[PDB]
Amino acid sequence: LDVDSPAEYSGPEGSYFGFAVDFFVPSASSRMFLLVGAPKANTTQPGIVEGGQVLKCDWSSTRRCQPIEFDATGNRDYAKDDPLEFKSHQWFGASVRSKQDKILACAPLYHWRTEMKQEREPVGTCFLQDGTKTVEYAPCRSQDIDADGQGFCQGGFSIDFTKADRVLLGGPGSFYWQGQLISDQVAEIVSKYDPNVYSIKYNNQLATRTAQAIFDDSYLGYSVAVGDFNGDGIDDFVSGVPRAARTLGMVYIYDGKNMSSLYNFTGEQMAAYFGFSVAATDINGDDYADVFIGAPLFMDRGSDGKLQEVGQVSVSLQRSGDFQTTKLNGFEVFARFGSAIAPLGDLDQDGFNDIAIAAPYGGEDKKGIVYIFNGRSTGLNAVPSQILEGQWAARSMPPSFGYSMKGATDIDKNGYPDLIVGAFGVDRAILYRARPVITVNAGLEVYPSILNQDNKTCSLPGTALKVSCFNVRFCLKADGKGVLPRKLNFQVELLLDKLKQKGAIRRALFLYSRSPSHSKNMTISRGGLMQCEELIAYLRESEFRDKLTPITIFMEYRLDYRTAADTTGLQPILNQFTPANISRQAHILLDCGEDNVCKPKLEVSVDSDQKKIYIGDDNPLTLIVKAQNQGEGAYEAELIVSIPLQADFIGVVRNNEALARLSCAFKTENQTRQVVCDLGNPMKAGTQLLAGLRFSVHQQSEMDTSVKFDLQIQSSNLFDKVSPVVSHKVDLAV
Amino acid sequence: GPNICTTRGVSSCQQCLAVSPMCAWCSDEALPLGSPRCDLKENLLKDNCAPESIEFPVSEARVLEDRPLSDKGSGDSSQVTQVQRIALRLRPDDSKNFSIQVRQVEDYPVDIYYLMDLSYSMKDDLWSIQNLGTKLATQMRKLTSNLRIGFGAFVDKPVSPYMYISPPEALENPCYDMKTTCLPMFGYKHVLTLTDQVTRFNEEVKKQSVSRNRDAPEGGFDAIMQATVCDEKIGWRNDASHLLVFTTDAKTHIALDGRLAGIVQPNDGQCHVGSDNHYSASTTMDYPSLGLMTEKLSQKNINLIFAVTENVVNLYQNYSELIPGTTVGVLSMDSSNVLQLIVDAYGKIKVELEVRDLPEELSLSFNATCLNNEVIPGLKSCMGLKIGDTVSFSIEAKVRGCPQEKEKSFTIKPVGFKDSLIVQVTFDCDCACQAQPNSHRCNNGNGTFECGVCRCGPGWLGSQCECSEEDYRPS
Numbered sequence A: 001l002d003v004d005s006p007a008e009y010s011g012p013e014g015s016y017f018g019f020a021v022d023f024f025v026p027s028a029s030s031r032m033f034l035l036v037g038a039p040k041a042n043t044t045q046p047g048i049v050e051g052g053q054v055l056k057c058d059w060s061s062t063r064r065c066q067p068i069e070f071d072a073t074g075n076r077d078y079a080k081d082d083p084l085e086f087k088s089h090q091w092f093g094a095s096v097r098s099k100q101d102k103i104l105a106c107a108p109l110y111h112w113r114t115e116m117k118q119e120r121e122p123v124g125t126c127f128l129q130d131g132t133k134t135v136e137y138a139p140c141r142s143q144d145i146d147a148d149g150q151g152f153c154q155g156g157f158s159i160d161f162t163k164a165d166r167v168l169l170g171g172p173g174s175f176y177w178q179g180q181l182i183s184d185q186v187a188e189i190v191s192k193y194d195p196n197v198y199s200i201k202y203n204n205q206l207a208t209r210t211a212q213a214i215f216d217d218s219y220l221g222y223s224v225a226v227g228d229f230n231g232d233g234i235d236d237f238v239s240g241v242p243r244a245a246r247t248l249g250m251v252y253i254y255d256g257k258n259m260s261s262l263y264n265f266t267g268e269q270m271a272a273y274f275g276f277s278v279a280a281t282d283i284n285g286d287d288y289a290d291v292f293i294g295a296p297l298f299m300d301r302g303s304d305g306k307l308q309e310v311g312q313v314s315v316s317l318q319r320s321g322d323f324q325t326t327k328l329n330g331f332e333v334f335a336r337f338g339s340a341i342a343p344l345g346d347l348d349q350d351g352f353n354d355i356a357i358a359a360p361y362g363g364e365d366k367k368g369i370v371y372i373f374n375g376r377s378t379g380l381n382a383v384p385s386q387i388l389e390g391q392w393a394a395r396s397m398p399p400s401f402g403y404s405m406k407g408a409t410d411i412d413k414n415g416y417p418d419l420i421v422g423a424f425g426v427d428r429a430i431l432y433r434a435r436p437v438i439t440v441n442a443g444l445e446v447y448p449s450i451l452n453q454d455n456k457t458c459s460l461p462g463t464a465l466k467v468s469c470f471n472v473r474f475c476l477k478a479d480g481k482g483v484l485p486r487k488l489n490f491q492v493e494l495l496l497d498k499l500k501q502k503g504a505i506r507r508a509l510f511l512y513s514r515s516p517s518h519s520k521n522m523t524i525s526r527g528g529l530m531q532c533e534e535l536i537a538y539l540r541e542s543e544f545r546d547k548l549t550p551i552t553i554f555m556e557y558r559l560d561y562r563t564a565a566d567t568t569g570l571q572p573i574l575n576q577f578t579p580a581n582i583s584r585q586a587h588i589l590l591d592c593g594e595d596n597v598c599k600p601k602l603e604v605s606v607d608s609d610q611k612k613i614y615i616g617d618d619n620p621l622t623l624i625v626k627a628q629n630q631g632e633g634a635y636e637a638e639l640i641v642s643i644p645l646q647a648d649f650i651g652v653v654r655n656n657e658a659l660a661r662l663s664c665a666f667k668t669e670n671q672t673r674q675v676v677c678d679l680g681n682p683m684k685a686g687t688q689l690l691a692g693l694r695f696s697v698h699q700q701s702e703m704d705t706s707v708k709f710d711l712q713i714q715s716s717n718l719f720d721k722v723s724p725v726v727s728h729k730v731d732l733a734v
Numbered sequence B: 001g002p003n004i005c006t007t008r009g010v011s012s013c014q015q016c017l018a019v020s021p022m023c024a025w026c027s028d029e030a031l032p033l034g035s036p037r038c039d040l041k042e043n044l045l046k047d048n049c050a051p052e053s054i055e056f057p058v059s060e061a062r063v064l065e066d067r068p069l070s071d072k073g074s075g076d077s078s079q080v081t082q083v084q085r086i087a088l089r090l091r092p093d094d095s096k097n098f099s100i101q102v103r104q105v106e107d108y109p110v111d112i113y114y115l116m117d118l119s120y121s122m123k124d125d126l127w128s129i130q131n132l133g134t135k136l137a138t139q140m141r142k143l144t145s146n147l148r149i150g151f152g153a154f155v156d157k158p159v160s161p162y163m164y165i166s167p168p169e170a171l172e173n174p175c176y177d178m179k180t181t182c183l184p185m186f187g188y189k190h191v192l193t194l195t196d197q198v199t200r201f202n203e204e205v206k207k208q209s210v211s212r213n214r215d216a217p218e219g220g221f222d223a224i225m226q227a228t229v230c231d232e233k234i235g236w237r238n239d240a241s242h243l244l245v246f247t248t249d250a251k252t253h254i255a256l257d258g259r260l261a262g263i264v265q266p267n268d269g270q271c272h273v274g275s276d277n278h279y280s281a282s283t284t285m286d287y288p289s290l291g292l293m294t295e296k297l298s299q300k301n302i303n304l305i306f307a308v309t310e311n312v313v314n315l316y317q318n319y320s321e322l323i324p325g326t327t328v329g330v331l332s333m334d335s336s337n338v339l340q341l342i343v344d345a346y347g348k349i350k351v352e353l354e355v356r357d358l359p360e361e362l363s364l365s366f367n368a369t370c371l372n373n374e375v376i377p378g379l380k381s382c383m384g385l386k387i388g389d390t391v392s393f394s395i396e397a398k399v400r401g402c403p404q405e406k407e408k409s410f411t412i413k414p415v416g417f418k419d420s421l422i423v424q425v426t427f428d429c430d431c432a433c434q435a436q437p438n439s440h441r442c443n444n445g446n447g448t449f450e451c452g453v454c455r456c457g458p459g460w461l462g463s464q465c466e467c468s469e470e471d472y473r474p475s
């Protein structure tokens, strides 16, 4: 989904614009729209305050949301004078549903004053719009009056359309808030529509029956969903009952042909509001749809043992087996995770349907968040693929972002499903469009898998210098779907030793461009081939004191950022599982054993010629050191020899064949002064070394009596990297 | 080796005193020839210095007022005491140690707030809640003396689904359609603030009457939230243990129920009780969830108790398991079931020491002797004790230098026990022989023997006037 720049819709301030959302696809034209319900909006109706609106928002390039005029009349008057009806503060637009060219908008809080007595009953009413017609459907406005009947039914609190266009209403208030489910065909509603009679009945309506007083205050119909669970092509009704089972909550599935109960799924914790929202869709790739139940107020025990309110979603897979198969829990307190659920369809087109879940108080600043959970074989993933949060700044009132959701429909026809998120706290709705997914993998290989430290058979171009250059190659291949153009564009970066952090010596270069790193722009035919290229590199001789470790060949690739967007106006995205980062180790061999891991060892000794020195004037001094090596050769060896403060180093003895040709550059950063001599070129196993260092002594007074030396030597490789300390002394005579 | 007192070549009792509090000076004229004047007291005694002629009487501390602590909190004929008072004497750079104990005699403070359901379904339970309220005040007074008790009432949100609004008469008389009379409905009203006048509580409780609404569940949890967070309106005492008793005979509304009435705003968990003592945000905020209630209850340290009828005891038992620390009792004619819970809360109801008016140059150290005679170094507090338990502490004191003031005092202060451990401090930084110029100890006189230096007059100089400027050549 595109989070960087979604499309946002704004309604009148304070309207609750965004309380309900849905897609609209009429048959009269190819035009695409979005329906947003605004239950608190003021209307044109005479003598009605905050009657509610439903606003039509086209997907055109230049558009503003426009209210749908379902009903312009004010409240009906009874015989004589007083009003029959109370349309003020009816929540028209609290629920909005659509089925091709049909729209169902409901006002759960609509009241009416019956005949036979002065009452005020929130029966609730729905308006059903067709391509031409607009009809009223208020099945709970009946002759059964009062809370003992259907007076407080609030029909239309939750609604949905069956695939064959049946209207489904849930009224939580019928029969002392037992709740009720009511449904009719669009044909039945239109056939029996007589606007001049308030208590009209639909002759083939399906409704749940009144039950015992034991079941009061259950709120059956708080939320509804449709799916096939009996297996005969007629969608069944899924209804939430968040206060039943003595407040544990439960969800019923009713046969779509006769309203008889099929299955019950019960919450695990009282007051969790198990059933606040429900959804039905197959997620594990079978033919059979599965059930989702939200419990926004679920509490789970924290580390210290106290209960923490995070919310939870229950998943029931079907072939339906009573006990839930997997759960998703919120990670933040009072987030109300699971307040909304929406099937996304096959969001990533990988072959399994995905779900979207909302927490109207999750995220930073508690603005609310929507979590995308990808489906797959054996159900939903334990972790979300994406998080959506309101990008507008938080304010005093919550945005309630993610309160309402709808997906599984394609708006721009780019081939991927899109999503609608409503935030009625700011009077906004926001549109997220799915971007094309590009799945790719790469290759990285070297012909001389092991690099020789001294082969140097390869010459530089037009230059006398010869180096141990080697041949390397890399590959990249991609696949895509949707309207994704087949000419994909990638950028790949090659690096030889980028892991040499903290400014460590760069040690290798590419032959062309003579640089350690190189960036290559690439273009690939989607799924058309696997493409490879070759390169030449060489080490830069060998001015690096890092032969202890191999070269860290490295590469990374990303989609060509600056490429033009597609026709629909979006840029593709790499699949999350792709290995955008890849590396291999190139080993270095001088003579480091048949196993390529040599095991060095070091021996050393020290002596001095003029072991007696005078005081009061400059006197010469010399130090003699010898080293013996063990193992498969040695390199990087260094004389770490400390020297006193009262003498200065005046060079090694280069002018005798009996002594090794060392090179020295002494350092005096601290009182632990060092002579710092290199032992020269690499040497083979069993080699012996002898050297002599000259010094000048500048003792000023007889307070001192001797001078002392301490030394150490480095190893060939990581094993026994530095030798123990050895010491020597020189005496002062007088 | 030899001690500091002798090795420093002390010349006078003033310098001997200044060197260290452990040093002593012998003022006796009979001291043997050559013996040092400044030395440890045992060495002076070995040299036959008269004990009373030695300038070092050991530092000491002793009582000043030591009334024994009380054993019963009733205070039959005198004010109780729970701490006693001492005086201290010090040398320069001196230190001393001592100990003290405290006891919890007086009864713990307790606050009980009573929430009454006044729904019409409570009409036949009205006597039971009135009876229970009376015996809460009465029976608690036999456990603690300083009780504070108040009460409030709730019915439900006064909005369309719950409230009768159909005929204009129904607003004034919710029982109109039954052709009888009852009071107008209300969300939650605070009636009586926490007070010790139990007789006032009984009279106000017995004059309450039921209102009426439509749906069985009530808005009791709105009252629990407001009683918890409106501390200044309710009057919760910052130091008392807080008990909240909740009564009802029906199930309860919870968060997300307000959506039916058009209420979607979450409960803020803040005080919304005005001067009319009514919950003003009743019709605009949703009911609180169990998670939010548990947060505020723990934050305000309030122990909630449910006193509910049998038919809903299981429903609230499950709620209690999700609100840690709360308990449930059965509401009936016999109120003994719920009274036991109040007894239990009191049966499971702490001291720390402050220091005030400490001198500018005196310091302290503390250690604790907690329950079971366990000793903890550095601690100055003890927890977990009940009424009648006694705990003890030990204190070490030290000074640096010596002030010119002869006497000053400070005190230690336990939290809330009303008593003060006033300690008096005196300083004895002087020598007896120093009470009373032209001393023969100087070179042929010409000097005053004070502070260990003669301070010679004209024509002489040195520690003891041993030199003259004409002989004290610069070379």
Ligand SMILES: N=C(N)NCCC[C@@H]1NC(=O)[C@H](CCCCN)NC(=O)[C@@H](Cc2ccccc2)NC(=O)[C@@H](CC(=O)O)NC(=O)CNC1=O
Residues within 6 Å of the ligand: A147, A148, A175, A176, A211, A212, A213, A214, A216, B119, B120, B121, B122, B123, B124, B211, B212, B213, B214, B215, B216, B217
């Ligand atoms: N369709 C159905 N399932 N009807 C069954 C519902 C039964 C459900 N209860 C009853 O009828 C019983 C009749 C016999 C049992 C005594 N309680 N009457 C009541 O419940 C009334 C008054 C009363 C209470 C207690 C004792 C005597 C009389 N109590 C209420 O709390 C009010 C509202 C209020 O003031 O809070 N109404 C409701 O709670 C819901 N209304 C009712 O009608």
